[PDB]
């Protein structure tokens, strides 16, 4: 775990497939800060996250992030045409 930063850097979704196209729907919103496989396998449950583990807070151009942009989809309804987020 914790290779580059997260396991496969899965903080870049269209907001219409990995979280809408009949995907997982069981471990993505399992009340746990929504980590979705990141620096720790505990899923940010309570091992001691540092937030800076992302090393790309300013990167959110269609990133559909969860911790940095939990505000909304962002860069979707007003940025890149993902699908039904416009």
Curated annotation (Swiss-Prot):
Q: Where is this region: Cysteine-rich?
A: 22-37
User: Sorted alphabetically, which InterPro entries does this protein's record hold?
Assistant: IV_Tat (IPR001831), Tat_dom_sf (IPR036963)
Q: Which GO terms describe its biological process?
A: DNA-templated transcription; positive regulation of transcription elongation by RNA polymerase II; positive regulation of viral transcription; symbiont-mediated perturbation of host chromatin organization; symbiont-mediated suppression of host innate immune response; symbiont-mediated suppression of host translation initiation; symbiont-mediated suppression of host type I interferon-mediated signaling pathway; viral gene expression
- Database matches in Gene3D superfamilies: Tat domain
- The record lists Zn(2+) 2 as bound by 25, 27, 30
Q: Which portions of the chain have biased composition (kind: Basic residues)?
A: 48-58
Instruction: Kindly state the positions of the motif Nuclear localization signal, RNA-binding (TAR), and protein transduction in this protein.
Output: 49-57
* Pfam (any one): Tat
Q: Where in the cell is it found?
A: Host nucleus, Host nucleolus; Host cytoplasm; Secreted
Keyword vocabulary terms for this entry: Acetylation, Activator, AIDS, Apoptosis, Host cytoplasm, Host nucleus, Host-virus interaction, Inhibition of host innate immune response by virus, Inhibition of host interferon signaling pathway by virus, Interferon antiviral system evasion, Isopeptide bond, Metal-binding, Methylation, Modulation of host chromatin by virus, Modulation of host PP1 activity by virus, Phosphoprotein, RNA-binding, Secreted, Transcription, Transcription regulation, Ubl conjugation, Viral immunoevasion, Zinc
N6-acetyllysine is carried by which residues? Answer: 28, 50-51
Region annotated Disordered sits at 2-21, 47-86
Q: Where is this region: Core?
A: 38-48
Give any GO molecular function from the UniProt entry. Answer: actinin binding
Cross-link for Glycyl lysine isopeptide (Lys-Gly) (interchain with G-Cter in ubiquitin), residue positions: 71
Location of the motif Cell attachment site: 78-80
Q: Where is the composition biased (Polar residues)?
A: 60-77
Q: Where is this region: Interaction with the host capping enzyme RNGTT?
A: 49-86
* Domain comment in the entry: The cell attachment site mediates the interaction with ITGAV/ITGB3 and ITGA5/ITGB1 integrins, leading to vascular cell migration and invasion. This interaction also provides endothelial cells with the adhesion signal they require to grow in response to mitogens. The Cys-rich region may bind 2 zinc ions. This region is involved in binding to KAT5.
Provide the family line: Belongs to the lentiviruses Tat family.
Task: State the oligomer form and interacting partners.
Answer: Interacts with host CCNT1. Associates with the P-TEFb complex composed at least of Tat, P-TEFb (CDK9 and CCNT1), TAR RNA, RNA Pol II. Recruits the HATs CREBBP, TAF1/TFIID, EP300, PCAF and GCN5L2. Interacts with host KAT5/Tip60; this interaction targets the latter to degradation. Interacts with the host deacetylase SIRT1. Interacts with host capping enzyme RNGTT; this interaction stimulates RNGTT. Binds to host KDR, and to the host integrins ITGAV/ITGB3 and ITGA5/ITGB1. Interacts with host KPNB1/importin beta-1 without previous binding to KPNA1/importin alpha-1. Interacts with EIF2AK2.
Q: What is the annotated role of this protein in its UniProt record?
A: Transcriptional activator that increases RNA Pol II processivity, thereby increasing the level of full-length viral transcripts. Recognizes a hairpin structure at the 5'-LTR of the nascent viral mRNAs referred to as the transactivation responsive RNA element (TAR) and recruits the cyclin T1-CDK9 complex (P-TEFb complex) that will in turn hyperphosphorylate the RNA polymerase II to allow efficient elongation. The CDK9 component of P-TEFb and other Tat-activated kinases hyperphosphorylate the C-terminus of RNA Pol II that becomes stabilized and much more processive.
Other remarks on record? Answer: This truncated variant has a premature stop codon. It may have arose as a consequence of tissue culture passaging. HIV-1 lineages are divided in three main groups, M (for Major), O (for Outlier), and N (for New, or Non-M, Non-O). The vast majority of strains found worldwide belong to the group M. Group O seems to be endemic to and largely confined to Cameroon and neighboring countries in West Central Africa, where these viruses represent a small minority of HIV-1 strains. The group N is represented by a limited number of isolates from Cameroonian persons. The group M is further subdivided in 9 clades or subtypes (A to D, F to H, J and K).
Q: By what name is this protein known? A: Protein Tat
Name the species this protein comes from: Human immunodeficiency virus type 1 group M subtype D (isolate Z2/CDC-Z34) (HIV-1)
């Amino acid at each position: 775990l914790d290779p580059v930063d997260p396991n496969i850097e899965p903080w870049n979704h269209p907001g219409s497939q990995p979280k809408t196209a009949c995907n997982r729907c069981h471990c993505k919103k399992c009340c746990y800060h929504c980590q979705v496989c990141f620096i720790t396998k505990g899923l940010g449950i309570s091992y001691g996250r540092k937030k800076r583990r992302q090393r790309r807070r300013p990167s959110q151009g269609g990133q559909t992030h969860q911790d940095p942009i939990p505000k909304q989809p962002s860069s979707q309804p007003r940025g890149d045409p993902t699908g039904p987020k416009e």
